[PDB]
RNA sequence: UGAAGAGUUUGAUCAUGGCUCAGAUUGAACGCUGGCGGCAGGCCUAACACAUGCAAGUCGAACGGUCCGGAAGAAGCUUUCUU
């Protein structure tokens, strides 16, 4: 079934009235395989606590990128907040060429081969942000045709 | 068919920005150590001063003499001497 993907875990600190209360941030990435990516960025007081809340966050927002041939349909450039990201399709035999944010959601996604890219801020709260916004402007030829 | 970044200026955050790191290479040197073989390679620093040896000849099918060698003569032998 789904399998989930651990991106980064940070400690987070913050001052208050009264000391240091410690929150941790955990991104994850559910996927099947075969087309559904999920990204999932949940706190806890707790690193399990965050990481779990996290995969449920993940499989409640997913996106059906439209797989071809372990590719994509056409390049494209998100830009989050100061970051920036690029992908690029590429025949069978090069595999996912990728920052580990990148493509520890693009494998879930089910893509085998493709040419990224990181620009701007290195941010991964912000790059995995632009890759799935990216993996949600893909369009086909056949959505476009019947688009049009 | 071709491009992963990370550490550090904050109490914490973001941005700007400088510095820094794992790799590969060098007709190298230095330290500890050191068995064999093949190929390759060796003043990268003063045109500073130099002992000693060595760094171009070849032709008598161009011509007259010495040095080295062979052969034949005048002689009984030797010396000497001739071609």
Redesign the pocket.
């Known amino acids: 079934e789904l399998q989930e993907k651990l991106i980064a875990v940070n400690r ?4 208050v009235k009264g000391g ?1 209360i410690f929150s941790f941030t955990a991104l994850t990435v559910v996927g099947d395989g075969n087309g559904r990516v999920g990204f999932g960025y949940g706190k806890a007081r707790e690193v399990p606590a965050a990481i779990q809340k996290a995969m449920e966050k993940a499989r409640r927002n997913m996106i059906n990128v439209a797989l071809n041939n372990g590719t994509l349909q056409h390049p494209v450039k998100g830009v989050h ?3 920036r990201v690029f992908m690029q399709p ?2 069978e ?3 996912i ?4 944010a990148m493509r520890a959601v693009l494998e879930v996604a089910g893509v085998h081969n493709v ?1 990224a ?2 620009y ?5 709260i ?1 790059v995995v942000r632009a890759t799935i916004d990216g993996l949600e402007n893909m369009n086909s030829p056949e959505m476009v045709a019947a688009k049009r």
């Open positions: 987070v600190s913050k001052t240091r907040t100061g970051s590429a025949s035999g090069t595999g060429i990728a920052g580990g040419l890219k990181a701007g801020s290195t941010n991964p912000n």
